[PDB]
Design a protein around this ligand. Sequence first.
Ligand SMILES: O=C(O)c1cc(-c2ccccc2O)nc2c(Cl)cccc12
Ligand SMILES: [Zn+2]
Length: 349
Amino acid sequence: GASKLRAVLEKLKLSRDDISTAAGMVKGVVDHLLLRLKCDSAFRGVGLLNTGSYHVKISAPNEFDVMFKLEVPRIQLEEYSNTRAYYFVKFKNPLSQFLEGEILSASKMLSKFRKIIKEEINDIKDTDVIMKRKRGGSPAVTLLISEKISVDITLALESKSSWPASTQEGLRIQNWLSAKVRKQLRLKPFYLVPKHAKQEETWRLSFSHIEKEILNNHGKSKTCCENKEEKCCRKDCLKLMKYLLEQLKERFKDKKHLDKFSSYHVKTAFFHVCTQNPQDSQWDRKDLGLCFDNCVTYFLQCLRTEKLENYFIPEFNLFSSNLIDKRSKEFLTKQIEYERNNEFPVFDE
Ligand SMILES: O=C(O)c1cc(-c2ccccc2O)nc2c(Cl)cccc12
Ligand SMILES: [Zn+2]
């Protein structure tokens, strides 16, 4: 049981250099775009947000996520219709061209963003890239690099203001990472990505920079995982949870039953389990089997109760029916429940 999970992690390490070399060209292309974008007055202050293990984030087997941040001077937010996560953007400048009255148009800003990138990909066709526009608005643009590697590029407005009121009861890390750290983290900027709600000129809050920071400095002890005496299995548990969902989606690709589920749901439930299990002694590497069952069991509870709170916006249920069919949640409950009750045969060789 424990050795089966260690074998999965060892197998996942086998592609460590196939995803390290892929991201090395993603970073090549992305820095190419970052300059062209800086020639435009609206995106002059654009920069790469630190969101991944490489600016380059990996959320799939071999497909990448990159965010472009844009320092937007003092912003005023108006919450869209009690959604707690979707907002209109206003001011109190080079983004003047994108207003529709007092509101910043996301679709307008997004469109010029695309026009700039589709020209850069096509003009220097001397680099083998094309782009397929996905449906979310986030991701803004998807680039296929040599018909194998995929990179999602997200535009995001940076606000150095205090976090909006919907987050004031979120980031419940006080018993785990401390109140000192929670105060430090909430003095950092927050981001807004163009996302329509289910359509409008709305923006959605994003804290992927905070997520990376609490994954890479994840212990109650400041020296967690910096020496042989303090090796926890937090990151391994999150890896196995992502891989469990990835493998299940493959198995049920015949009907795409599980297509509404995302590694973000798995990552969100894993942060709630860290809150629930705050001591590094609850994540001792030798207890991997038990720590993974703790993660799986909480995710099942979320599926069965149809409630997975956003870690930063607790009134935003990622598992609400507005977002995910009741039939799909019940489906995945049954499949994860089977996997757990039988020592995860999806991990068999
Ligand atoms: O960038 C982020 O922090 C981020 C936020 C959210 C989110 C935020 C508010 C309400 C609902 C959401 O689903 N979803 C994400 C997904 Cl699904 C994938 C990757 C990143 C994110
Ligand atoms: Zn650790």
